[PDB]
Write a protein that binds this ligand. Structure first.
Ligand code: NAG
Ligand code: NAG
Ligand code: NAG
Lengths: 126, 50, 50
């Protein structure tokens, strides 16, 4: 039974700091590429970033630049994300999702993209 | 194995695991000499009774 | 073609394996001129076997 737990929500004073973190039940957290999806209040889904199995390659979307940092802790079974600022983007619901594309899948010559299988509970970011 | 007798050479082939062999009466039919790989079997000093 | 986490995607050939259980028994073993096992008799297998 796979469950990803969101945390670090609530309305805070706008700007300069905000903490988000996503946990994962079981011992299959490591070695699975993970992405963060932010749900606009009325404008659909959007992207935050992506981190690989070891974090050597990282990439970010064009919506935000220079404010987000993504890291994974293998022992604590929790992935950590930080926003260095809080812009006018408010009431955005942030999900953490796990994609089964493991290191071996992109290691093989095959060029394949799977789907974001399991999602988190969600949180409120203002 | 300690004994008294004469030692006679032979060409009895053996299985890989055990160079040493036992007879059908479980007597030592042949024991391979340690230094020399030639098969050497025990023959009694006493042959069939006079 | 299918993701690793799902049971699908781990296809292999059709292989069947046997599992037996050992129970204490007394078996006569027949060796051969060269020293390899050729035939055996299981006592409990039959009245003829006994
Ligand atoms: C699946 O594997 C996980 C460990 O990754 C385990 O905790 C769980 O009990 C297993 N079975 C189910 C119900 O999915
Ligand atoms: C054993 O060692 C001696 C020298 O100490 C040598 O002369 C002899 O040939 C060796 N025998 C074997 C079993 O090789
Ligand atoms: C013993 O082994 C030799 C190997 O060349 C073979 O020719 C012979 O048939 C075997 N005899 C028996 C009794 O298995």
């Amino acid at each position: 039974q796979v469950q990803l737990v969101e945390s670090g929500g609530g309305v805070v004073q706008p700007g300069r700091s905000l903490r988000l973190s996503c946990a994962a039940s079981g011992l299959t957290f490591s070695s699975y590429v993970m992405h963060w999806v932010r749900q606009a209040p009325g404008k659909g889904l959007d992207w935050v970033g992506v981190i690989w199995y070891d974090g050597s390659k990282k990439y970010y979307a064009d919506s935000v630049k220079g404010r987000f940092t993504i890291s994974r802790d293998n022992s604590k079974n929790t992935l950590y994300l930080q926003m260095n600022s809080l812009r006018a983007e408010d009431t955005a619901v942030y999900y953490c999702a796990r994609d089964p594309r493991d290191y071996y899948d992109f290691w093989s010559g095959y060029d394949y993209y799977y789907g974001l299988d399991v999602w988190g509970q969600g949180t409120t970011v203002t | 194995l300690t004994g008294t007798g004469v030692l006679t050479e032979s060409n009895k082939k053996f299985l890989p695991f055990q160079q040493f062999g036992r007879d059908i009466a479980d007597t030592t039919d042949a024991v391979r000499d340690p230094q020399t790989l030639e098969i050497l079997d025990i023959t009694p000093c006493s042959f069939g009774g006079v | 073609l299918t993701p690793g986490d799902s049971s699908s995607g781990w296809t292999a050939g059709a292989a069947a394996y046997y599992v037996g259980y050992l129970q204490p028994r007394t078996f006569l073993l027949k060796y051969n001129e060269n020293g390899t096992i050729t035939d055996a008799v299981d006592c409990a297998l039959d009245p003829l076997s006994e």
